[PDB]
Design an enzyme around this catalytic site. Structure first.
Site, PDB file in Angstrom:
ATOM      1  N   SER B 106       0.856  -1.187   0.000  1.00 47.30           N
ATOM      2  CA  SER B 106       0.000   0.000   0.000  1.00 47.30           C
ATOM      3  C   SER B 106       0.892   1.237   0.000  1.00 47.30           C
ATOM      4  CB  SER B 106      -0.877  -0.090   1.242  1.00 47.30           C
ATOM      5  OG  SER B 106      -1.849   0.942   1.287  1.00 47.30           O
ATOM      6  N   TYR B 129      -2.311   5.657  -6.066  1.00 49.51           N
ATOM      7  CA  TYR B 129      -3.349   6.607  -6.451  1.00 49.51           C
ATOM      8  C   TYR B 129      -2.654   7.727  -7.270  1.00 49.51           C
ATOM      9  CZ  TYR B 129      -6.380   5.113  -2.557  1.00 49.51           C
ATOM     10  OH  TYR B 129      -7.195   4.432  -1.706  1.00 49.51           O
ATOM     11  N   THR B 155      -5.364   2.117  -8.013  1.00 47.12           N
ATOM     12  CA  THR B 155      -6.747   2.134  -7.503  1.00 47.12           C
ATOM     13  C   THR B 155      -7.567   3.059  -8.374  1.00 47.12           C
ATOM     14  OG1 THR B 155      -5.826   1.667  -5.330  1.00 47.12           O
ATOM     15  CG2 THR B 155      -8.110   2.672  -5.406  1.00 47.12           C
ATOM     16  N   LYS B 221      -7.231  -1.235 -10.624  1.00 43.97           N
ATOM     17  CA  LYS B 221      -7.905  -1.907  -9.523  1.00 43.97           C
ATOM     18  C   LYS B 221      -9.211  -1.236  -9.137  1.00 43.97           C
ATOM     19  CE  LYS B 221      -7.105  -3.504  -4.711  1.00 43.97           C
ATOM     20  NZ  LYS B 221      -8.270  -2.754  -4.178  1.00 43.97           N
ATOM     21  N   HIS B 245     -13.086  -2.650  -3.558  1.00 48.58           N
ATOM     22  CA  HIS B 245     -12.235  -2.092  -2.486  1.00 48.58           C
ATOM     23  C   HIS B 245     -12.565  -2.677  -1.165  1.00 48.58           C
ATOM     24  CE1 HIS B 245      -9.979   2.056  -1.882  1.00 48.58           C
ATOM     25  NE2 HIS B 245     -10.006   1.525  -0.655  1.00 48.58           N
TER      26      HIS B 245
HETATM   27  C1  LIG Z   1      -7.658  -1.176   5.862  1.00 45.22           C
HETATM   28  C2  LIG Z   1      -7.790  -1.320   4.367  1.00 45.22           C
HETATM   29  C3  LIG Z   1      -7.264  -0.330   3.526  1.00 45.22           C
HETATM   30  C4  LIG Z   1      -7.375  -0.469   2.100  1.00 45.22           C
HETATM   31  N1  LIG Z   1      -6.877   0.491   1.304  1.00 45.22           N
HETATM   32  C5  LIG Z   1      -7.011   0.345   0.015  1.00 45.22           C
HETATM   33  C6  LIG Z   1      -6.456   1.389  -0.875  1.00 45.22           C
HETATM   34  O1  LIG Z   1      -5.841   2.365  -0.440  1.00 45.22           O
HETATM   35  N2  LIG Z   1      -6.586   1.178  -2.222  1.00 45.22           N
HETATM   36  C7  LIG Z   1      -7.222   0.082  -2.741  1.00 45.22           C
HETATM   37  O2  LIG Z   1      -7.355  -0.066  -3.952  1.00 45.22           O
HETATM   38  N3  LIG Z   1      -7.727  -0.864  -1.899  1.00 45.22           N
HETATM   39  C8  LIG Z   1      -7.645  -0.774  -0.536  1.00 45.22           C
HETATM   40  N4  LIG Z   1      -8.207  -1.784   0.231  1.00 45.22           N
HETATM   41  C9  LIG Z   1      -8.925  -2.987  -0.372  1.00 45.22           C
HETATM   42  C10 LIG Z   1      -7.948  -4.164  -0.575  1.00 45.22           C
HETATM   43  O3  LIG Z   1      -6.898  -3.821  -1.415  1.00 45.22           O
HETATM   44  C11 LIG Z   1      -8.823  -5.300  -1.169  1.00 45.22           C
HETATM   45  O4  LIG Z   1      -9.576  -4.790  -2.267  1.00 45.22           O
HETATM   46  C12 LIG Z   1      -9.881  -5.784  -0.125  1.00 45.22           C
HETATM   47  O5  LIG Z   1      -9.346  -5.598   1.164  1.00 45.22           O
HETATM   48  C13 LIG Z   1     -10.059  -7.335  -0.404  1.00 45.22           C
HETATM   49  O6  LIG Z   1     -11.195  -7.794   0.343  1.00 45.22           O
HETATM   50  P1  LIG Z   1     -11.056  -8.698   1.631  1.00 45.22           P
HETATM   51  O7  LIG Z   1     -10.456  -7.973   2.880  1.00 45.22           O
HETATM   52  O8  LIG Z   1     -12.504  -9.320   1.992  1.00 45.22           O
HETATM   53  O9  LIG Z   1      -9.976  -9.812   1.346  1.00 45.22           O
HETATM   54  C14 LIG Z   1      -8.064  -1.617   1.608  1.00 45.22           C
HETATM   55  C15 LIG Z   1      -8.545  -2.570   2.458  1.00 45.22           C
HETATM   56  C16 LIG Z   1      -8.432  -2.454   3.836  1.00 45.22           C
HETATM   57  C17 LIG Z   1      -9.027  -3.504   4.732  1.00 45.22           C
END
Ligand SMILES: Cc1cc2nc3c(=O)[nH]c(=O)nc-3n(C[C@H](O)[C@H](O)[C@H](O)COP(=O)(O)O)c2cc1C
Ligand SMILES: Cc1cc2nc3c(=O)[nH]c(=O)nc-3n(C[C@H](O)[C@H](O)[C@H](O)COP(=O)(O)O)c2cc1C
Ligand SMILES: Cc1cc2nc3c(=O)[nH]c(=O)nc-3n(C[C@H](O)[C@H](O)[C@H](O)COP(=O)(O)O)c2cc1C
Ligand SMILES: Cc1cc2nc3c(=O)[nH]c(=O)nc-3n(C[C@H](O)[C@H](O)[C@H](O)COP(=O)(O)O)c2cc1C
Lengths: 350, 350, 350, 350
Positions: B106, B129, B155, B221, B245
């Site tokens: 991240s 981003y 993203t 994404k 997300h």
């Molecule tokens: C705390 C947290 C922060 C996240 N931040 C982003 C982000 O900045 N950009 C992004 O594309 N996805 C983000 N995601 C989504 C993950 O990349 C992924 O799409 C999602 O967590 C997958 O689903 P799952 O937790 O049920 O496995 C985030 C998820 C969590 C839990």
């Protein structure tokens, strides 16, 4: 206040069996979705009963592989019944004989074919796995034939064991004075050995192989897709058992009652198709036959009733299902199994 | 009594993490309908397993953008992992390397690309981003390339942040000794700054822009409609990640497993399509691949296991999913990912 | 810990209002099936969001009958607001003016048109019933016109009152110092009188009658079938409000969001179609517009927030819905109400 | 706080009746799936109400077999009402006469035809079973004709009794001072005798037989398939009662409201089709008529209200249903039963 239904025996087993034993028998694979669905799917099928039909005399008798029995409800092979009750498989064999139905003994029984045959006459099937050590497969078969077993129920849905998480958390082990008796007195502690013999290489040619070492009819157990049913017809199986192994293998396979019809169709009337998985009521039994099953098998209720009431418990499970099945035939307007038709039922998916 | 499934790690995280931290990671958008549905939709897909297939040797290895990995389960970028455990992203990187799979870091990590690269070799992707200050976007990219990252996961579903109400009620803030390390040592406290950089003006031409400042493959994404998948093909994305997300953006978007197929079709085999959102079982993983995913990503389980067990926890999450996935392949009759077909599954909507 | 959603205001109202007052406002008809379904049906509609669209500037402004307002969320007429808060309708009028939206005053208000007009300028609609005593209908209309009301919202779904059982069990009565102010100072205690004036003989010709005594546009409120929508077009209604009266009339009528489309189609773009019933989120609002509504009205949240926080509460309800609606437009890729299309949504019934 | 709905009477009956008595009346067959579904299926039918129709005067009067009654809600035959209240069937007969509707007396009543006829004039039907001892069937018929009963309701869904497990657990028996009065003073303790008389040999020719011993119209009660409805037309039944016997016979038969239409169609307008099973609201009643029923019957509410309030209770049940039915007609835009159409309803299955 009395025990009126089969499902009630499970509750009693559960309050008296050690947690490890109960869980062993009760558990399904992983999140146990199919476990639940095996039961739930019967509620998606309704009746279309005919009225004002003379239903004085109901004939539930059927013929299974040339063997004429009292009803189309047989007993499925479960395993180590002596964990549930001292008499374990002896009690189950005496109750099945008494009821005029067939018992399927597990190769994992805590009683051997001969000791089961020593309880008295009665038609019995023997469940097996094509073990790694093929010399072992032949001795079990021979021993089965000798003891008077009439058919082999070959499990074909277990190249590997499914994950039943309670067993892992309970650190499950076979209690001290018990043994897998069919694996003793032959040419090979035992639990581990038998677990290691499960051959993950089996293919259709291995079923052909089995036919060269035995003359008994072979029922492939664990077929749920039309594709595999046709291959079973091809490789000369004497019948197919639509099963999902009591939902203990792979989760998310359909409820056997839902896969039933597709399999019945693929078989094209060539061989008998049976079913097991979640059968608990006389109504369940009717739906399966209206869909095309030639009969059904029950697993868990037997161990649960055994644990609760010994041989009287299994006797009771069988009496309750034939009673409930006869009343369902009466109320639907059916005087023989031959009279049960597809039109006496309406499925959610029709 | 042991930990047998991934979902169990969430319960333990929850009993030990401060409420604000747990909620931060666990929460979905507004009424969290899609949060729930991300999981629930996997239960609407059943299996059609083939039996009696030699399943001695299972090959789960796959090639993702020319990088050959041990299995099709990769780690999704989450954020500020050091709130969950001291070692935070270092532990996650060592476990992903150990498992032979890919990690997606991240841009909000509490560890920078170089410190993550200092744990050892291993294929890693970097999430980003298109920030307002485009000079900043270029330094992150350069820094990522330098540290040895192989692709950029862009993203594209966050012009603005979705409303996760628990954070508001918990008055969420990044704990004292932590920092968004990728934003330190470059040419621009940080939480607020980074939150303000999210550009709500981005369009397809901004993705073209990114291709002029980097030679690394770009994976868009957050694509869930067939319309956007085709545009991503057009604007030369190296693959698409069907994601919502982790259900934290807009509520009431479909479960990724439900949108998957429409996106897979629109891509017309031109580029790899991946998925994330609610993947918790080896069975989940199978369904996604049978639908067309080239692999899946996991998010929350990683932070939850990290919080519970440190690096051993993430190691365990990965081992449990590959074990469960291999058994699902065995039981469905699949010897390679190539063997997984659409016919091994039956979806409620088929 | 803060109030983040509208639905939360209901819980607070409930803990502080006397049971009789809460029940009065909250209750639906008989078993309240439609009450529940009014909310639940919004969860059967999903989004199909477009990404990477410049969403810097969102325009929520709309024009309703030549009146340009700040957003497509208006306030529905409820009744006796002074039971909920001392300022009752004065507070609601000041918050609607402040928000740049329209208020629909109830003829059962505990405040009269003139006192509501004394709070300041702002576009306001007046709800009415074709009362038995037609001379009374004309004085209300005149008084409404005088006070500066811009349209009449004619309830056409109440020939008789539906049975709301809590009121019967609570022996509901209007508290001591309150009065139905629009019925005082005209040529005719009041609760009973007004209840007896509801004319159960009304027909389409009575709507024609109303057009001979007023020049203001008439919006027929309570149309849910395509048949009645076409008749409303015919009898020259200025717009239709798809409503089920907050589910307080007949139970088992569809959720307004489900009947919406059929009504929108029947109107053939001739006149504006609006909706009310269960709207609580910015997401709800989007779905209604994507289906064809020209705007929506909210009822219960207003009385609930009034009871909790006075004028600040209604101000807050309106701010929360426009905020949540703007973010939903951003995340779906819509820069104006004109950009919201049918393709940005997928309904369970599509 | 008052009693506002019928369903509430059940709760009160239950808190005051001995468990054995309550269970007797309340119970369904085996797992009671149809019991529940008898109610639940009414919630799958919605309204399509017409507005702005003069609904000053509502006419609920109907003509049933040449007998003009006040409303289309009649009372179904239940059994041994004196277990619920001292006056038992006398109270039910006085309330049915008072309401201007028809009562169906059970052959299992704890009151005989003559004692029921001694309460006053009123149209009454008599329920019967073609008992084994045909001489007994003729004396009941004669006695019924004498006492002034206008039709015979012949149960045709009970060749055998369904299994209602609570009765078995409660070891159910008829209380001491009560008797099955229609079986006393004729040419044949009684409970057992009457239970043994149920003829499981009945066929369509037995219905022909009944027509040679009586001139009264015969309504076959318990028809739920289109096949049997056509045979009933053939064998000259005066009307059909779509019933599942209050769900006490075979489980998993459809809800009567779901089977209704198929039966109404098969009858081809030749004879009146009625319904019973789960009718508790004026809304329920409307749906049944919109589907084609010529009227409905209520069973359990009568015994429950009897137990709670004596004759005032049954009086109240009837007043509540006609009130609720008249308001439903008003709100749907129907001025007569003739005006109720298929278009005023939308069924889940349409
Ligand atoms: C705390 C947290 C922060 C996240 N931040 C982003 C982000 O900045 N950009 C992004 O594309 N996805 C983000 N995601 C989504 C993950 O990349 C992924 O799409 C999602 O967590 C997958 O689903 P799952 O937790 O049920 O496995 C985030 C998820 C969590 C839990
Ligand atoms: C404890 C236990 C062990 C079993 N072992 C086997 C086995 O070795 N081979 C097999 O084919 N089925 C096995 N089964 C499945 C049964 O033969 C049958 O398919 C299933 O139990 C029927 O479902 P039911 O319990 O809902 O009646 C086992 C079942 C249980 C409960
Ligand atoms: C207490 C109360 C009184 C109402 N009175 C009327 C009325 O007199 N006429 C009318 O057309 N609608 C009336 N309504 C319905 C509202 O105008 C609107 O249709 C409904 O409240 C919107 O649904 P909602 O509360 O879920 O937002 C009333 C609603 C409430 C809660
Ligand atoms: C205690 C009891 C006894 C009944 N006995 C009979 C019977 O002898 N013959 C018959 O046709 N129906 C019998 N019924 C069914 C009723 O006539 C009617 O079909 C059913 O009660 C209507 O459903 P409801 O109670 O939901 O209104 C009986 C019902 C009850 C509750």
């Amino acid at each position: 206040m009395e025990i009126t239904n089969v499902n009630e025996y499970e509750a009693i087993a559960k309050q008296k069996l050690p947690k490890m034993v109960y869980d062993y028998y009760a558990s399904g694979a992983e999140d146990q979705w199919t476990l639940a669905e095996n039961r739930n799917a019967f509620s998606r099928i309704l009746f279309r009963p005919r009225i004002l039909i003379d239903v004085t005399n109901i004939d539930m008798t059927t013929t299974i592989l040339g063997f004429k029995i009292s009803m189309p409800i047989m007993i499925a092979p479960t395993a180590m019944q002596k964990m549930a009750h001292p008499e374990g498989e002896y009690a189950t064999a005496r109750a099945a004989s008494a009821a005029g139905t067939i018992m399927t003994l597990s190769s994992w029984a805590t009683s051997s074919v001969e000791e089961v045959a020593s309880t008295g006459p009665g038609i019995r099937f023997f469940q097996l796995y094509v073990y790694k050590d093929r010399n072992v497969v032949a001795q079990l078969v021979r021993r089965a034939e000798r003891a008077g077993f009439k058919a082999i129920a070959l499990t074909v849905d277990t190249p590997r064991l499914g994950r039943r998480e309670a067993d892992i958390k309970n650190r499950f082990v076979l209690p001290p004075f018990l043994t897998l008796k069919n694996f003793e007195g032959i040419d090979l502690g035992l639990s581990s050995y038998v677990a290691g013999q499960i051959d993950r290489s089996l293919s259709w040619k291995d079923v052909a192989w089995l036919q060269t070492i035995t003359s008994l009819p072979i029922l492939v157990k664990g077929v749920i897709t039309a594709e595999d049913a046709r291959l079973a017809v091809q490789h000369g199986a004497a019948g197919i058992i639509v099963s999902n192994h009591g939902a203990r293998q792979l989760d998310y396979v359909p409820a056997t009652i839902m896969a039933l019809e597709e399999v019945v169709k693929a078989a094209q009337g060539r061989i008998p198709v049976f079913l097991d998985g979640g059968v608990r009521r006389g109504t369940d039994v009717f739906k399966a036959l209206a869909l095309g099953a030639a009969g059904v098998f029950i697993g868990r209720p037997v161990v649960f009733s055994l644990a609760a009431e010994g041989e009287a418990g299994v006797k009771k499970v069988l009496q309750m299902m034939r009673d409930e099945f006869e009343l369902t035939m009466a109320l639907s307007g059916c005087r023989s199994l031959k009279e049960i038709s597809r039109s006496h039922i309406a499925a959610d998916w029709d």
